[PDB]
């Protein structure tokens, strides 16, 4: 469904059907992609949806690979209702920038073998430089949980116990990593975009994207994995 | 009345002594209907006398004045009462009808005919006469069909019924072109009773309400004619037990199902039970709490789209299991709630972030806060909200009152249906008094091991 | 005009109280209903007349 | 059939448990049509006075049926769209006072302008009604040619029964069988009592509301709470009780 | 979309069916049991 | 003459010669309860962690994921789902279904149908054996209690995550949260239920004491005193009178329970009606009818708040309130 | 997951039909006593 036919459906017609998670596509557009003349152009209604969630799996024998995984959370991942500014030139240089909107989604995915991998699928504070065929950059990645989040045994970051209370002989080595640290330091992720199927008379772009971002460290207990996110992205362009 | 020596029933089963006495049984019903309409009139007059106009109707412990107010008898374009004379007229008419019905019931209980067949064959009946019982059932079905068509006539021609879904915050709306689509009505009756569908509570507009009422009235009238002009089929005779106790048990099961269903209407429905008269439902005042804090924290300057609460899901906006954008708090259970102050704010993809940023009406702003304060919490001795509060405000929701009471009555009537169905089966089989002691069924069976 | 309405309503209340007290008494008495028919009919007629009078006087008061 | 309306075990004006069977007056023993035993005042006296007042009751009943039809039907036609010019019953005489004349609407080929003035109408009405009321008491009629019997002579009303003369007044027969004749007599007297009550209602409603009974019923069906005896007795409205 | 679902929950589907095959197997099973009961009623 | 398939099927289902009576209520009792038993056992043994609070926070619950019998439980459905009817086919995969708490919905729905058909089967066997049928009426009280705690309380609160967890520590967690949010100990229906179980224990002890006390020598210090006569005689000689005599002489001799039928009817009705009352109390608190709120209800002549045992209960209740689902709440006061 | 739904729907419809038609099949007549 395109954006014109998405607005033509009521809320009750699309409720419980999964259409609200889909991003609208471009049907009458062209693949020339070089139809954008001006710059400083302020795109809006930027929206992204993934098509695959692959987790980097470093073994202990020395080679690099990604594995297909199964999603645990329902259609609650996905990026919608966010805007920004794009500075596209005549030669083709594209300056992407996203400022505000629903620019994150908490997602839990299951590795083969039954290991839960939570991560925050974010695109917040993303600046993209490059041509129409491919422009990439970096985006800020929050940890996962806030500083007021409390684990099973209090502890927590800003609030909590900062120790496992129901063990009176504690606060020693091999527990500082779990009790005392409780780090919430933000990470950074790199994504690469591509523009295809552009609509000229109304300003619509809908390409594909590939994103690499670190996984969740809970509160710094275990090192982060790397999640590869591929999918489609759409944004109104006015 | 008789004693236990002649009837075999003790005083705590005295109404069983009049099972076979049609005249006294009729007197018991007429006096009882007088009692019901007496409660209607007396409680209506009590709620009128204890009425403060400037306060909203749900903050006063009123259960049936909202029932008249839903019909639109003396309410304004915002739920404002304006006048209470229709309420007074309803109470007085119910009280006078109670006097008439009580006189009739007392007359037939005391000096009425003992049994009706020897003098009035039209009203005389035996429990085994399936044709006569279906005749009485058809008479009552025609009466119920006329009762439903009375509400249909009021909604269509007498300029009544209050639409809470009307723009601006509801208004008394005369209904034109009700949806009488058979697929639509049967779709409401066969859909799932769970959260996504809601079975029959999820009717959300007066057009569908009056279409279903047209259907139920026409069906009741046609079925009344059918039972008057027919006799039960042999398969029905083989399946059912034909006695006065079995008929009571069937009625008990049906009315217990009705009581459970009405409890569910009270707790969840906001169309046939408008919030301006009944108070907020369960889902709202929690959705309202999630909305007021969003519009407060975006007035203070914080970005509600960034959100990211303590668990990284969203303090104000999040995503439901389906891709619709919903309120980010713990009230993601009530994400399927629909309200008059929500739908103009809501779109296809979700809650319409642009509308949440720009288009919020002051009437919605006032309504959501006043719904948040008057939640369907409350404690049984009045007092305020959650069980840990203090003696500050005197408010318990009428939705809570007539949901709890109706669930209790529905469960008791299911228990009574079990009791009467079992006793009717045992009485038809002949062993409702005990085991015969000289030929018991167990000694005629082989041992299990 | 409301004073006449209040007197009629008070009379209706007293007549209804007398009826509630006496109709079971008349009915359940040994052969008392067959001789109290006149007084019971007069009481019921007065009660209905008072109800109709209060209803009519509501419009003027 | 006939036992329900005649004999000791008949429908009375009060039920058995509210009225004993020996409380009926002795001059009402279920021998006349419509005998419900309703005579609380000492007006019937004896059986011959009851029979004498039965003639007044039957004449008033038939005149009231003709009345009730003549009030309801033309006013309904006028309100629904027919060119009646005076369909309301308490003002139909004022349309002929000076020079006006009532248009007759003989359905379906109605709307005809009658040219007879009020004086001629009154003269012919008094003449014809005096003639028929004198023929009723005397029981003599000169000419014939009724569908009941072809060209009956003058010597046929003599020997008949007064207050129920069969023959020339019975074109459709269906009354020679005595049992259905008695049942239809009960039907006639009950319809006549209903018509009397209805025409008294028409007069009282006209005096109270100022409009016709058809206007009354149409406005009541349009809004029963907004238009009834309570509303028309009140006046315009009342201040809302807030 | 990373996974496939029927997405039939909600929307007021009659008897919860989202495909015609479900209504057909329901009707066929009821018809089979009714046919067995009818041809085998009254203890034959 | 039972030569047709449905005739022999009806005669086998209805038959009382089976070791366990099936009946027309059993044809639904058996498959639903077997499904619930299988799914409950498999989930209790090896279910993956279930995110109950809908905040991407899974509770383990199953033994293979590191807990014992006392703390192991089948975890209620996810909070984000609500009471939204989540079966296996509505999930994208079994892993997602297990993450979102679908086993709880499956087991609870099948258990509700099974206990309803268990009441029906009790009636059916009472009918086929020529008995009186109100044993099912007596059994309607635990069915009401289990039904109210498993489906009606989730219906009132808006989510199956409010259901009682299928376990022991989960039951205690549900009970404590219920105290915090409804003040159940301050509810007269719960008081009636507590009085009912205490009185049921009292009356069971009294009935056992009065029947086992009122004996005659038929079983000596050995296994049996059959020296008068062996097995195979109808001579009933237990006692009829001295039990009622002792119970009368115990307090005031006018608490007449000489009628054994009246005594047993009282034994049946008292705990049953009290469990009915406490089940309906739970059902009423499901719609937030809550308990008695006498907090800050006693004030002195200057209006200063005087503390109370009810105030101490309030302090404990709000201490429980601030500790329940510490990461689930965003907005200040908690509304179902 | 569609064929799982088909199988479960068939099973539930089967058992419900057994319930309904078994209670239709002369159920009050299965008593040890008269009538
Ligand atoms: C037999 C019953 C009869 C009744 C109940 C009435 C009743 C009435 N006529 Mg009337 N009329 C009746 C016969 C006759 N009127 C008239 C000729 C008139 C006239 C000319 C007028 C009335 C008018 C009236 C009204 C006021 C007087 C009204 C109450 C007056 C009217 O309509 O005032 C508004 C009026 O002007 N009547 C004639 C001669 C044809 C009658 C002959 O039987
Ligand atoms: C053997 C011998 C016989 C024994 C019999 C034993 C059985 C029963 C005995 C009586 C049972 C009730 C006793 C308590 C009556 C009472 O103290 O009376 C209590 C009240 C007190 O009256 C007034 O009650 C008011 C209550 O506020 C109400 O009004 C307020 C605004 O004014 C708010 O709107 C608030 O929400 C609303 O609740 C205020 O507190 C006033 O101060 C107070 O004077 O009276 C009332 O209401 C009366 C209510 C009438 C009955 C209602 C039944 C309950 C119906 C539905 C709820 C079901 C619940 C099931 C679970 C339990
Ligand atoms: C079989 C396995 C168990 C089945 C459990 C069924 C639970 C039914 C339920 O979830 O009940 C609730 C439903 C209503 O569900 C709600 O229906 C609502 C309808 O409101 C909607 O429509 C409204 C009107 O416009 C508003 O707009 C509102 O905003 C909007 O959301 C919503 O869909 C909610 O999401 C949804 O929660 O009611 C109903 O099903 C009415 C039917 C009666 C239910 C009675 C439950 C108790 C039954 C027996 C207890 C005793 C048993 C014997 C004991 C011994
Ligand atoms: C909804 C409540 C209700 C109603 C309508 C009835 C009705 C009836 N019961 Mg019953 N009963 C009830 C509750 C009720 N009962 C309860 C709770 C119990 C358990 C304690 C009993 C136990 C019981 C027994 C043991 C018997 C009855 C019997 C009867 C019947 C006749 C009574 C009689 O013959 O003696 C006459 C009774 C009186 C004269 C006293 C009543 C006084 C009057 C009628 C009522 C009050 C006056 C009233 C306000 C007047 C209204 C005024 C009016 C003008 C507006 C009658 C139809 C009898 C029966 O079964 O018939 C064979 C019988 O023996 N009942
Ligand atoms: C469930 C309602 C009901 C039923 C089935 C009966 C049935 C019976 N009544 Mg009875 N009655 C009733 C209510 C009822 N009554 C009430 C409420 C009163 C108080 C006014 C009376 C007062 C009464 C008396 C005084 C007597 C009877 C008598 C009788 C018996 C003779 C037939 C008859 O109809 O008499 C006639 C009853 C009437 C004419 C009452 C008027 C009914 C009108 C036509 C209203 C029509 C109903 C209409 C649909 C509106 C319904 C109400 C609406 C607001 C919902 C008969 C078996 C007689 C008897 O017992 O024989 C010994 C008798 O003496 N009844
Ligand atoms: C202590 C006893 C008691 C009391 C005080 C109440 C009180 C109440 N019940 Mg209730 N009930 C009870 C016992 C009780 N119930 C029991 C034991 C059961 C079985 C479990 C039920 C089952 C039940 C159900 C299913 C429902 C109620 C409902 C109600 C509420 C409205 C009553 C109503 O209007 O119904 C209906 C009245 C009638 C059917 C009489 C027919 C007359 C109709 C209404 C006339 C038509 C009006 C017309 C349109 C007016 C226009 C005028 C015209 C000229 C234009 C009310 C506060 C309703 C509710 O609010 O839901 C919670 C409802 O749906 N009850
Ligand atoms: C409209 C429904 C209805 C009707 C018409 C009947 C009719 C009848 N029932 Mg029955 N019953 C019903 C519902 C109904 N029942 C329900 C819902 C239950 C479950 C609670 C029962 C349980 C029941 C039992 C156990 C028995 C009967 C019996 C009887 C017969 C004699 C009644 C009598 O005189 O006892 C006299 C009436 C009283 C003594 C008053 C009862 C007082 C109750 C128990 C206290 C509660 C009332 C209180 C004010 C409400 C508190 C609030 C509430 C929510 C708890 C009679 C034909 C008897 C029977 O089987 O005869 C064949 C009998 O043994 N019923
Ligand atoms: C006892 C007390 C009863 C009290 C109250 C009763 C409440 C409601 C009564 C039923 C209302 C719903 C009517 C049927 C709706 C329906 O079938 O939905 C069908 C639902 C919905 O089915 C689901 O629908 C979803 C969309 O909303 C999705 O499509 C899902 O994939 C789909 O599975 O499935 C069921 O719940 C069927 C359960 C069958 C249980 C049968 C038990 C029979 C027991 C005894 C035999 C009796 C005869
Ligand atoms: C998605 C749509 C949702 C809405 C649709 C819902 C439809 C529900 C219709 C059920 C109403 C039937 C009432 C019969 C009840 C038992 C009567 C009986 O005791 O019956 C017994 C009685 C004994 O005398 O017999 C008889 O009177 C015979 C009367 C019974 C009528 C038989 C039904 C028609 C049979 C059709 C067979 C289906 C065949 C298989 C189709 C296969 C397709 C692939
Ligand atoms: C009004 C209205 C409406 C409508 C509704 C409807 C339409 C309903 C219905 C319904 C229906 C349409 C129903 C039906 C039914 C039936 C039933 C419910 C039944 C039953 C029974 C049973 C349970 C059975 C049993 C048995 C068996 C099982 C077999 C054998 C025999 C016996 C009997 C045993 C609507 C909502 C739209 C809107 C609003 C209002
Ligand atoms: C038989 C019997 C019984 C039952 C009884 C009953 C149920 C009765 C009743 C009855 C009734 C059901 C009644 C009712 C009534 C009513 C009345 C009597 C009324 C009235 C009126 C008036 C007078 C009013 C006035 C007023 C007004 C107008 C308004 C304002 C206010 C006032 C109040 C002023 C018993 C149980 C005992 C026992 C058994 C036997
Ligand atoms: Cl929250
Ligand atoms: Cl907790």
Which H, E and C letters describe chain B, residue by residue? CCCHHHHCCCHHHHHHCCCCCHHHHHHHHHHHHHHHHHHHHHHHHHHHHCCCCCCCHHHHCCCCHHHHHHCCCCCCCCCCCCCCHHHHHHHHHHHHHHHHHHHHHHHHHHCCCCCCCCCCCCCCCCCCCHHHHHHHHHHHHHHHHHHHHHHHHHHHCCCCCEECCCCCCCEECCCCCCCCCHHHHHHHHHCCCCCCCCCCCCCCCHHHHHHHHHHHHHHHHHHHHHHHCCCCCHHHHHHCCCCCCHHHHHHHHHHHHHHHHHHHHHHHCCCCCCHHHHCCCCCCCCHHHHHHHHHHHHHCCCCCCCCCCCCCCCCCEEECCCCCEEECCCCCCCCCCCCCCCHHHCCCCCCCHHHHHCCCCHHHHHHHHHHHHCCCCCCCCCCCCCCCCCCCCCCCCHHHHHHHHHHHHHHHHHHHHHHHHHHHHHHHHCCCCCCCCCCCHHHHCCCCC
Q: Which region holds residue F246: left if phi is over 0, alpha if psi is between -120 and 50, else beta?
A: alpha
Tokens found for residue B331: 């009230």
Q: Which of F16, F27, F76 minimizes the C-alpha distance to F50?
A: F76
Candidates E26, E37, E42; nearest CB to G9: E26
The one-character DSSP state at A167 is -
Q: In angstroms, rounded to a whole number, what is the distance separating the alpha carbons of residues B278 and B64?
A: 10
Is the torsion defined by CA of A17, A20, A23, A24 positive or negative? Answer: positive
Q: Which of residues 230-289 of B touch G (CB under 8 A)?
A: 235, 238-241
What's the distance, Cα to Cα, between the start and end of chain D in Å? 58
Residue B414 to residues B422, F113, F116, F134, F143: CA-CA distances in angstroms?
12, 15, 12, 13, 12
| Neighbouring C-alpha atoms within 13 Å toward the C-beta of D159 | 4
Residue extents of the structural domains in chain C? 1-61
Q: What is the dihedral of CA A52, A58, A59, A62, to 10 degrees?
A: 120
Q: In angstroms, rounded to a whole number, what is the distance separating the alpha carbons of residues B333 and F84?
A: 9
Tokens found for residue A139: 């985006």
At D163 the three-state DSSP class reads coil
Query: How many residues does the structure list for chain C?
Result: 61
The position carrying tokens 């992720």 is A189
Resolution as reported, in Å: 2.8
Contact A22, A203 (CB under 8 A): no
Host H or E run for residue F125: helix F102-128
- The residue to mutate among B13, B31, B111, having the most atoms of ligand 11 within 8 angstroms of its beta carbon, is B31
The one-character DSSP state at B316 is S
Give every CB contact of residue A4 below 8 A, 6+ residues apart in sequence.
none
Residues of G with CB under 8 A from a CB of B: 23-24, 26-29, 31-35
Touch between chain E and chain B (3+ CB pairs, < 8 Å)? Answer: yes
Q: In angstroms, rounded to a whole number, what is the distance separating the alpha carbons of residues D85 and D102?
A: 6
CA of B309 to the centre of ligand 12 (A): 10
Is E29 close to G10, i.e. CB distance below 8 A? yes
- The residue to mutate among B268, B274, B337, having the most atoms of ligand 3 within 8 angstroms of its beta carbon, is B268
Is F335 close to B195, i.e. CB distance below 8 A? no
Contact F154, F84 (CB under 8 A): no
Give bridge partners of residue A88 from the DSSP assignment.
A94
Is the torsion defined by CA of F125, F131, F132, F134 positive or negative? Answer: negative
Q: Which of B351-354's residues contact partners 24+ apart within 8 Å by CB, and which partners?
A: B351/B317, B351/B324, B351/B325, B351/B326, B351/B327, B352/B325, B353/A81, B353/A101, B353/A102, B353/B305, B353/B317, B353/B325, B354/A81
Q: Which of C56, B75, B73 minimizes the C-alpha distance to D225?
A: B73
CA angle E27, E29, E34 (to 5 degrees): 90
Give bridge partners of residue A111 from the DSSP assignment.
A115
**Closest-CA distance of chain B to residue C5, Å:** 15
Residue F103 to residues F145, F151, F215: CA-CA distances in angstroms?
21, 14, 52
Continuous H helices in D2-117: 47-80
Q: In angstroms, rounded to a whole number, what is the distance separating the alpha carbons of residues B249 and A164?
A: 60
Q: In angstroms, rounded to a whole number, what is the distance separating the alpha carbons of residues B423 and B420?
A: 5
Domains in chain D (CATH in brackets) are 47-234 (1.10.3460.10)
Residue A109: CB atoms within 10 Å: 23
Neighbour-count burial of A1, counting CB atoms closer than 10 A to its CB (0-12 exposed, 13-18 middle, 19+ buried): middle
Neighbour-count burial of D35, counting CB atoms closer than 10 A to its CB (0-12 exposed, 13-18 middle, 19+ buried): buried
Contact A211, A228 (CB under 8 A): yes
Touch between chain F and chain B (3+ CB pairs, < 8 Å)? Answer: yes
Q: In angstroms, rounded to a whole number, what is the distance separating the alpha carbons of residues B159 and A224?
A: 66
Query: How many residues does the structure list for chain D?
Result: 242
Tokens found for residue D185: 């007599």
Q: Which residues of F fall within a CB distance of 8 Å from B321?
A: 80-81, 84, 100
Q: What is the dihedral of CA D13, D19, D21, D23, to 10 degrees?
A: -90
Ligand nearest to the CA of B191: 8
Residue B11 to residues B15, B17, B110, F133: CA-CA distances in angstroms?
8, 9, 18, 22
Candidates E22, E30, E33; nearest CB to G6: E22
Residue extents of the structural domains in chain E? 1-44
φ, ψ (nearest 5 deg) of residue B348: -70, -50
Continuous H helices in B374-433: 398-429
Q: In angstroms, rounded to a whole number, what is the distance separating the alpha carbons of residues B65 and B71?
A: 10
Which residues approach ligand 2 with their CB closer than 6 A?
A: B 59-61, 380, 382, 394-396, 401, 404-405, 408; F 284, 289
Question: Neighbours of C (≥3 Cβ pairs closer than 8 A)?
Answer: B, D
Residue B405: CB atoms within 10 Å: 17
Q: In angstroms, rounded to a whole number, what is the distance separating the alpha carbons of residues F201 and D10?
A: 68
φ, ψ (nearest 5 deg) of residue F151: -120, -45
Q: In angstroms, rounded to a whole number, what is the distance separating the alpha carbons of residues B164 and B162?
A: 6
Host H or E run for residue A234: strand A226-236
Are β-strands D112-113 and B162-163 bridged in parallel, bridged antiparallel, or unpaired?
A: unpaired
Residue F299: CB atoms within 10 Å: 11
Give bridge partners of residue A154 from the DSSP assignment.
A151
Residue D162 to residues B282, B360, C14, D146: CA-CA distances in angstroms?
80, 87, 54, 19
Q: In angstroms, rounded to a whole number, what is the distance separating the alpha carbons of residues F162 and E4?
A: 29
Give every CB contact of residue C48 below 8 A, 6+ residues apart in sequence.
none
What angle separates helix B22-49 from helix B85-110, to the nearest 10 degrees?
160
Q: DSSP E strands: which ranges in A74-194?
A: 79-82, 84-88, 94-98, 104-111, 115-122, 127-130, 135-141, 187-194
Q: In angstroms, rounded to a whole number, what is the distance separating the alpha carbons of residues B51 and B57?
A: 8
Query: How many residues does the structure list for chain F?
Result: 336
Is B415 close to F276, i.e. CB distance below 8 A? yes
Cis upstream peptide for D108 (omega within 30°)? yes
Candidates G10, G17, G24; nearest CB to E25: G10
| Domain hosting residue F19, numbered range | 5-186
Q: In angstroms, rounded to a whole number, what is the distance separating the alpha carbons of residues D212 and A169?
A: 101
Q: In angstroms, rounded to a whole number, what is the distance separating the alpha carbons of residues A226 and A212?
A: 7
Q: Which of B28, B38, B81 minimizes the C-alpha distance to B244?
A: B28
Are β-strands F50-51 and A70-71 bridged in parallel, bridged antiparallel, or unpaired?
A: unpaired
Residue E18 to residues B289, E5, E7, F90: CA-CA distances in angstroms?
35, 12, 9, 11
Give every CB contact of residue D69 below 8 A, 6+ residues apart in sequence.
none
Are β-strands A66-68 and A44-56 bridged in parallel, bridged antiparallel, or unpaired?
A: antiparallel
Candidates E3, E5, E10; nearest CB to A15: E10
Contact B412, F272 (CB under 8 A): no
Q: In angstroms, rounded to a whole number, what is the distance separating the alpha carbons of residues E23 and E26?
A: 5
At A212 the three-state DSSP class reads strand
Q: In angstroms, rounded to a whole number, what is the distance separating the alpha carbons of residues B74 and B82?
A: 7
> In CATH, what number is assigned to the domain containing residue F154?
1.20.85.10
Check whether B149 is labelled as a binding-site residue: no
The one-character DSSP state at F187 is -
Residue D99 to residues A139, D86, D93, D96, D102: CA-CA distances in angstroms?
100, 14, 12, 6, 10
Q: In angstroms, rounded to a whole number, what is the distance separating the alpha carbons of residues F111 and D145?
A: 90
Contact D72, D214 (CB under 8 A): yes
The position carrying tokens 């004896």 is D46
Tokens found for residue B294: 């969003």
Q: Given strand A115-122, what is the order of strands in its sheet?
A: A70-71, A104-111, A115-122
Alpha-carbon E34 to chain mean position: 14
The coordinates were experimentally obtained by cryo-EM
Ligand nearest to the CA of B154: 6
Residues of C with CB under 8 A from a CB of B: 16, 23-24, 27-28, 33, 44, 47, 51
Give bridge partners of residue A85 from the DSSP assignment.
A97
Q: What is the dihedral of CA B43, B45, B47, B51, to 10 degrees?
A: 180
CA of B192 to the centre of ligand 3 (A): 9
What's the distance, Cα to Cα, between the start and end of chain F in Å? 60
What DSSP string describes B37-95?
A: HHHHHHHHHHHHHT--SSS-GGGGT-SSHHHHHHTTTT--TTS-----HHHHHHHHHHH
Contact A82, A112 (CB under 8 A): no
What DSSP string describes A20-76?
A: GGSPPB-SS-BS--------S---EEEEEEEEEEEEE---SSS---EEE-EE-S-TT
At A81 the three-state DSSP class reads strand
The position carrying tokens 């620019």 is A103
Q: What is the dihedral of CA F137, F141, F144, F150, to 10 degrees?
A: -140
SS3 content of chain B, % helix, strand, coil (to 5): 50, 0, 45
CA of B67 to the centre of ligand 6 (A): 9
Q: In angstroms, rounded to a whole number, what is the distance separating the alpha carbons of residues D7 and A170?
A: 109
At F132 the three-state DSSP class reads coil
Q: Which residues of F fall within a CB distance of 8 Å from G12?
A: none
Q: Which region holds residue E19: left if phi is over 0, alpha if psi is between -120 and 50, else beta?
A: beta
CA of B106 to the centre of ligand 4 (A): 8
Continuous H helices in F148-225: 153-157, 169-182, 188-213
- The residue to mutate among B21, B23, B29, B30, having the most atoms of ligand 5 within 8 angstroms of its beta carbon, is B30
The position carrying tokens 């023959």 is D167
Q: Which of A135, A136, A137, A132 minimizes the C-alpha distance to A196?
A: A132
Give bridge partners of residue A179 from the DSSP assignment.
none
Q: Which of F69, F27, F77, F32 minimizes the C-alpha distance to F50?
A: F77
Host H or E run for residue A206: strand A204-214
Q: In angstroms, rounded to a whole number, what is the distance separating the alpha carbons of residues B428 and B426?
A: 5
Q: Which of B132, D73, C59, B381 minimizes the C-alpha distance to F187?
A: B381
Q: In angstroms, rounded to a whole number, what is the distance separating the alpha carbons of residues B360 and B296?
A: 12
Tell the residue nearest (CA) to atom 39 of ligand 8.
G12
Is F331 close to B194, i.e. CB distance below 8 A? no
Tokens found for residue D190: 């009950």
Residue D21 to residues B104, B332, C40, D9, E18: CA-CA distances in angstroms?
21, 75, 18, 8, 71
Q: Which of F70, F68, F62, F66 minimizes the C-alpha distance to F42?
A: F62
Give every CB contact of residue B81 below 8 A, 6+ residues apart in sequence.
B51, B53, B57, B69, B74, B75, D242
CA of B305 to the centre of ligand 13 (A): 28
Contact A68, A54 (CB under 8 A): yes
Are β-strands A226-236 and A204-214 bridged in parallel, bridged antiparallel, or unpaired?
A: antiparallel
Tokens found for residue B434: 């005990």
Host H or E run for residue B268: helix B246-268
CA of B189 to the centre of ligand 10 (A): 8
Q: What is the dihedral of CA F29, F35, F40, F42, to 10 degrees?
A: 150
């Amino acid at each position: 469904l395109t954006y014109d036919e998405l607005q033509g459906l009521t809320y009750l017609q699309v409720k419980g059907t999964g259409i609200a998670n889909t991003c609208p596509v471009v049907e009458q557009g062209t693949s020339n992609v070089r139809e954008l003349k001006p710059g400083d152009y302020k795109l809006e209604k930027f929206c992204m949806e993934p098509t695959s969630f692959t987790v980097k799996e470093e073994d202990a024998k020395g080679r690099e690979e990604f594995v297909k995984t199964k999603l645990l959370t329902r259609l609650t991942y996905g990026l919608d209702g966010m805007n920004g500014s794009m500075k596209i030139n005549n030669d083709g240089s594209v300056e992407f920038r996203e400022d505000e909107g629903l620019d994150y989604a908490a997602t839990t995915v299951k590795l083969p073998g039954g290991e839960y991998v939570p991560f925050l699928f974010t695109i917040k504070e993303f600046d993209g430089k490059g041509t129409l065929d491919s422009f990439s950059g970096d985006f800020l990645v929050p940890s996962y949980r806030g500083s007021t989040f409390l684990d099973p045994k209090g502890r927590g970051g800003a609030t909590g116990y900062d120790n496992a209370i129901a063990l009176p002989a504690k606060a020693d080595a091999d527990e500082i990593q779990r009790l005392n640290n409780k780090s919430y330091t933000p990470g950074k992720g790199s994504a690469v975009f591509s523009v295809a199927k552009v609509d000229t008379e109304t300003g619509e772009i809908a390409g594909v994207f590939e994103s690499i971002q670190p996984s969740d460290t809970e509160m710094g207990a275990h090192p982060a994995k790397d999640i590869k996110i591929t999918g489609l992205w759409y944004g109104q362009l006015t | 009345g008789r004693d236990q020596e002649t009837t075999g029933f003790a005083w705590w089963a005295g109404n069983a002594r009049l099972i076979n006495l049609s005249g006294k049984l009729l007197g018991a019903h007429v006096a009882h209907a007088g009692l019901i309409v007496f409660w209607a009139g007396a409680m209506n007059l009590f709620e009128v006398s204890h009425f403060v106009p400037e306060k909203p109707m749900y903050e006063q412990g009123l259960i049936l004045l909202p029932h008249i107010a839903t019909l639109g008898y003396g309410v304004g374009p915002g739920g404002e009462v304006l006048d209470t004379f229709p309420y007074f007229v309803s109470g007085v008419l119910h009280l006078i009808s109670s006097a008439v019905l009580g006189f009739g019931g007392v007359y037939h209980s005391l000096i009425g005919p003992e049994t009706l067949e020897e003098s009035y064959p039209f009203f005389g009946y035996v429990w085994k006469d399936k044709n006569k019982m279906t005749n009485i059932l058809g008479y009552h079905l025609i009466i119920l069909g006329c009762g439903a068509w009375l509400l249909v006539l009021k909604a269509l021609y007498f300029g009544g019924v209050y639409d809470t879904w009307a723009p601006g915050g509801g208004d008394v709306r005369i209904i034109s072109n009700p949806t009488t689509n058979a697929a639509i009505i049967f779709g409401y009756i066969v859909k799932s009773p769970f959260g996504g569908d809601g079975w029959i509570v999820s009717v959300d507009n007066l057009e569908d309400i009056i279409g279903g009422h047209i259907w139920i009235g026409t069906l009741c009238i046609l079925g009344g004619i059918w039972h008057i002009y027919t006799t039960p089929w042999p398969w029905a005779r083989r399946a059912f037990v034909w006695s006065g106790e079995a008929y009571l048990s069937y009625s008990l099961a049906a009315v217990s199902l009705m009581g459970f269903t009405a409890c569910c209407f009270a707790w969840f429905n906001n169309t046939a039970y408008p919030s301006e008269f009944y108070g907020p439902t369960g889902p709202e005042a929690s959705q309202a709490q999630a909305f007021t804090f969003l519009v407060r924290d975006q007035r203070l300057g914080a970005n509600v789209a960034s959100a990211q609460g303590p668990t990284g899901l969203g303090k104000y906006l999040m995503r439901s299991p389906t891709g619709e954008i919903i309120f980010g708090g713990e009230t993601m259970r009530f994400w399927d709630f629909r309200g008059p102050w929500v739908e103009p704010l809501r779109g296809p993809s979700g809650l319409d972030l642009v509308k949440l940023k720009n288009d919020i009406q002051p009437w919605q702003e006032r309504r959501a806060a006043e719904y948040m304060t008057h939640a369907p919490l409350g404690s049984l001795n009045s007092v305020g909200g959650v069980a840990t509060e203090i003696n500050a405000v005197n408010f318990v929701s009428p939705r809570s009152w007539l949901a709890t009471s109706h669930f209790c009555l529905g469960f008791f009537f299911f228990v009574g249906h079990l009791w009467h169905a079992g006793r009717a089966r045992a009485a038809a089989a002949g062993f409702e008094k005990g085991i015969d002691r000289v030929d018991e069924p167990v000694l005629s069976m082989r041992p299990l091991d | 005009m409301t004073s006449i309405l209040q007197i009629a309503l008070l009379g209706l209340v007293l007549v209804s109280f007398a009826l509630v007290v006496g109709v079971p008494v008349v009915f359940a008495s040994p052969n008392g209903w067959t001789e109290n028919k006149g007084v019971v009919f007069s009481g019921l007629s007065v009660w209905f007349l008072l109800v109709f009078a209060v209803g009519v006087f509501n419009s003027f008061a | 059939d006939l036992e329900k309306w005649y004999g000791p075990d008949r429908k009375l004006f009060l039920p058995g448990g509210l009225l004993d069977r020996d409380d009926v007056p002795e001059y009402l023993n279920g021998e006349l049509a419509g005998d419900y035993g309703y005579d609380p005042l000492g007006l019937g006296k004896d059986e011959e006075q009851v029979e004498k007042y039965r003639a007044n009751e039957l004449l008033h009943a038939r005149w009231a049926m003709l009345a009730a039809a003549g009030i309801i039907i033309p006013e309904g036609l006028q309100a629904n769209g027919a060119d009646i010019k005076g369909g309301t019953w308490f003002e139909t005489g004022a349309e002929m006072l000076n020079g006006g004349t009532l248009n007759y609407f003989a359905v379906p080929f109605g709307v005809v302008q009658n040219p007879l003035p009020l004086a001629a109408v009154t003269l012919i009405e008094i003449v014809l009604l005096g003639a028929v009321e004198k023929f009723r008491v005397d029981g003599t009629g000169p000419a014939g040619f009724s569908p009941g019997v072809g060209k009956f002579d003058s010597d046929i009303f003599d020997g008949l029964d007064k207050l129920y003369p069969g023959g020339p007044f019975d074109p459709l027969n269906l009354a020679d069988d005595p049992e259905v004749f008695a049942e239809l007599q009960v039907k006639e007297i009950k319809n006549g009592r209903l018509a009397m009550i209805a025409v008294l209602a028409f007069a009282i409603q006209s005096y109270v509301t100022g409009e016709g009974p058809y206007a009354n019923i149409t406005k009541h069906l349009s809004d029963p709470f907004g238009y009834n005896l309570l509303t028309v007795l009140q006046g315009d409205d009342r201040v809302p009780t807030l | 979309l990373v996974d496939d679902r029927m997405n039939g929950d909600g929307t007021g589907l009659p008897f919860g069916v989202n495909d015609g095959i479900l209504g057909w197997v329901i009707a066929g099973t009821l018809g089979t049991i009714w046919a067995i009961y009818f041809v085998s009623q009254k203890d034959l | 003459e039972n030569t047709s398939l449905w005739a022999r099927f009806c005669e086998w289902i209805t038959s009382t010669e089976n070791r366990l009576y099936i009946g027309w209520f059993g044809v639904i009792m058996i498959p639903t309860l077997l499904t619930a038993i299988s799914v409950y056992i498999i989930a209790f043994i090896a279910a993956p962690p279930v995110d109950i609070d809908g905040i991407r926070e899974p509770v383990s619950g199953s033994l293979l994921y590191g807990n014992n019998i006392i703390t192991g439980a089948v975890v209620p459905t996810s909070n984000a789902i609500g009471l939204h009817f989540y079966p296996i086919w509505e999930a994208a995969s079994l892993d997602e279904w297990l993450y979102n708490g679908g086993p709880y919905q499956l087991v609870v729905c099948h258990f509700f149908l099974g206990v309803c058909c268990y009441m029906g089967r009790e009636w059916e066997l009472s009918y086929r054996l020529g008995m009186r049928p109100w044993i099912a009426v007596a059994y309607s009280a635990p069915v009401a209690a289990a039904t109210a705690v498993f489906i009606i309380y989730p219906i009132g609160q808006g989510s199956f995550s409010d259901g009682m967890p299928l376990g022991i520590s989960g039951t205690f967690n549900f009970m404590i949260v219920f105290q915090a949010e409804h003040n159940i100990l301050m509810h007269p229906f719960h008081m009636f239920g507590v009085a009912g179980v205490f009185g049921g224990s009292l009356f069971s002890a009294m009935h056992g004491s009065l029947v086992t006390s009122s004996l005659i020598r038929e079983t000596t210090e050995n296994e049996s005193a059959n020296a008068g006569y062996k097995f195979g005689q109808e001579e009933e000689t237990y006692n009829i009178v001295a039990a009622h005599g002792y119970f009368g002489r115990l307090i005031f001799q006018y608490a007449s329970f000489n009628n054994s039928r009246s005594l047993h009817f009282f034994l049946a009705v008292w705990p049953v009606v009290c469990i009915w009352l406490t089940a309906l109390g739970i059902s009423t608190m499901a719609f937030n009818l809550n308990g008695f709120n006498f907090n800050q209800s006693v004030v002195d002549s200057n209006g200063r708040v005087l503390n109370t045992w009810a105030d101490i209960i309030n302090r404990a209740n709000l201490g429980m309130e601030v500790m329940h689902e510490r990461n689930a709440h965003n907005f200040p006061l908690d509304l179902a | 997951m569609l064929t799982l739904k088909i199988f479960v729907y068939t099973v539930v419809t089967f058992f419900v039909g057994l319930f309904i038609f078994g209670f239709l099949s002369n159920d009050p007549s299965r008593n040890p006593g008269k009538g």
